[PDB]
Amino acid sequence: MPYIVDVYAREVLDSRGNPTVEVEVYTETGAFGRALVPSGASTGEYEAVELRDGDKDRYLGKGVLTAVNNVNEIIAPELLGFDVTEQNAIDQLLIELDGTENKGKLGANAILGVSMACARAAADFLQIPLYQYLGGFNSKTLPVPMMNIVNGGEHADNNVDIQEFMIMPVGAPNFREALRMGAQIFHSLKSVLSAKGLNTAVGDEGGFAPNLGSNEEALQTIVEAIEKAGFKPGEEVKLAMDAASSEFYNKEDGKYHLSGEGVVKTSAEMVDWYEELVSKYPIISIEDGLDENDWEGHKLLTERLGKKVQLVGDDLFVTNTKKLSEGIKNGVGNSILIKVNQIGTLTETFDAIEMAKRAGYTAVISHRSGETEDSTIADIAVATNAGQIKTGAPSRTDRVAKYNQLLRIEDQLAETAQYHGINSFYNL
């Protein structure tokens, strides 16, 4: 009965004025879906690459014609008269139309837009909410927001070598208090940085970017702001890092060049530095602590700390049906990094989360550092019981669209909505 009659993509402008692609799916009965095609970055080679025009004269390589023609003239004639409540058949049909492994024929963005519009239309046809269409009836556990607070490294001009510092409010009863706590910690940190006499302007992903001297100064300032906000660190507010150690790894000699501290550390001294930082400050998660071509040091790191600090890895578990299952076998790291708009459909996302739940890992919903978003990721973070979402975005009107979409789920689950808190750290 709910057969698809029209799949149609168009070009609209965002708040930034950049052109975005918008996929719509009509039915016979009048159900309606709508999803945004991402326009992000195409880093990596062993995963699904995103396809733009690449025209630097047209928005620095974010062209839309080759992304909208592939939807209107190839994908659309193969989806007439097809039933819309059959998500797995559509996700197999789109991959068979693509043909290659890295989705390089249609782009990994044009497939994801259709495969979420055809899942927002089926939730409109059945008159159930989208987090119950994707996840059953017992999908009621909102994730823990990872909220970028201080930038450094490539994103700023300062002597901070770690790229991103994050806070993770785990001592809150429900999601709304977990968001209010972060809203107060940002004000306390702006007060502290204005007391020191620094720049308090909002940087890239929402965090600040002051002129600091070392990593230890930043970890002093953030913990001092958490204490002045009124909360106890290590019990209610944890921290996290995104080290981005590939940026200061010199390949020719295999030594890490910490430009902030001016000290060249070898691959056995970085783990000794991370042990000191975990022993002094309440870090609970480290992202890309060592380069992915440093197996002799990475196997050391995953057992010196891997029982009390979460260690995620993106290119170590790069999103493919063969390469993500490679680092599972030798057992390095204890958490993987689900990136939805680099992974393809909605079937491969829920298989890649399940294969990480089996092998004892922990999924962290994330995104590449320049993509836009959409608002369906807040339903995938509830329906899969992922546990941690990374609420960063390149602009404020996408960040607030993450926040409101996760707050309009708790208001439907009124007497029922759980929250992880510290129970997401089961393997620590």
Partner 1 sequence: VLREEYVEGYVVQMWRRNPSNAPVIEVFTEDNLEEGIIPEYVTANDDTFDRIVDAVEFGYLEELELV
341 DSSP assignment: G
Q: How far is the CB of 385 from a copy of itself (least distance, A)?
A: 7
Among 287, 348, 371, 410, binds Mg ion (CB under 5 A): 287
Hunting for tokens 């996408």 — which residue is that? 398
Catalytic one of 47, 205, 292, 373: 205
Shortest gap between Cβ of 394 and partner 1 (angstroms)?
A: 14
Catalytic, 339? Answer: yes
Asked whether residue 242 is marked as a ligand-binding residue, the answer is yes
Q: Smallest distance, Å, CB 174 to partner 1?
A: 13
From CA 186, how far away is CA 222, in angstroms rounded? 10
- Binding partner selected for residue 287 from a copy of itself, partner 1, Mg ion, none, CB under the kind-specific 5 to 8 Å limit: Mg ion
Neighbours of 359 (CB within 10 A): 12
In contact, 391 and 399? CB cutoff 8 Å: yes
Q: Which of residues 67-86 bind a copy of itself (CB under 8 A)?
A: 85
User: Which residue among the candidates 238, 339, 348, 410 is catalytic per the annotation?
Assistant: 339
Query: Please, which residues have CB within 8 angstroms of residue 61's CB and are 6 or more apart in sequence?
Result: 52, 53, 54, 55
Give me the least distance between CB of 164 and partner 1, in Å please: 16
State the minimum distance, in angstroms, from the CB of residue 426 to a copy of itself.
5
Q: Is residue 415 part of the contact set for a copy of itself (CB under 8 A)? A: yes
Q: Is 364 in the site for a copy of itself (CB under 8 A)?
A: no
CA separation for the pair 303, 296 (Å, rounded) = 12
352-361 contacts at long range (C-beta below 8 A, 24 or more positions apart): 352/319, 352/324, 353/384, 353/386, 355/324, 355/325, 355/328, 359/328, 360/334, 360/427, 361/328, 361/333, 361/334, 361/335, 361/336
Instruction: Work out whether 180 is an interface residue with partner 1 (CB under 8 A).
Output: yes
Closest to partner 1 by CB, 339 or 367: 367
- Dist. CA 161–CA 246, nearest whole Å: 11
Where in 117-176 is the site for partner 1 (CB under 8 A)?
Answer: 176
Among all chains, which residue has been given the structure tokens 């890092």? 241
d(CA 125, CA 30): 8
Measured in degrees and rounded to the nearest 5, phi and psi for residue 278 equal -75, -35
Measured from the Cβ of residue 215, the count of other Cβ atoms closer than 10 Å reads 22
Q: Which of 38, 44, 113, 135 binds a copy of itself (CB under 8 A)?
A: 135
Q: Is 251 a catalytic residue?
A: no
Closer by beta carbon to partner 1, 111 or else 189: 189
Q: Judged by CB under 8 A, does residue 139 bind a copy of itself?
A: yes
| Per-residue binding letters, 375-414, with partner 1 (x by CB under 8 A) | ---------------------x--xx--xx----------
Tokens linked to 53: 């025009």
Looking up tokens 């996840």, which residue turns up? 135
Distance CA 240, CA 315 (A): 19
Per CB under 8 A, residues contacting partner 1 are: 176, 179-180, 182-183, 186-187, 190, 202, 206, 396, 399-400, 403-404
Binding-site sequence positions for Mg(2+): 242, 287, 314
Per CB under 8 A, residues contacting a copy of itself are: 85, 87-89, 92, 119, 126-128, 133-140, 347, 350-351, 354, 357-360, 383, 385, 415-416, 426
Catalytic residues: 205, 339
Binding-site sequence positions: 163, 242, 287, 314, 339, 368-369, 390
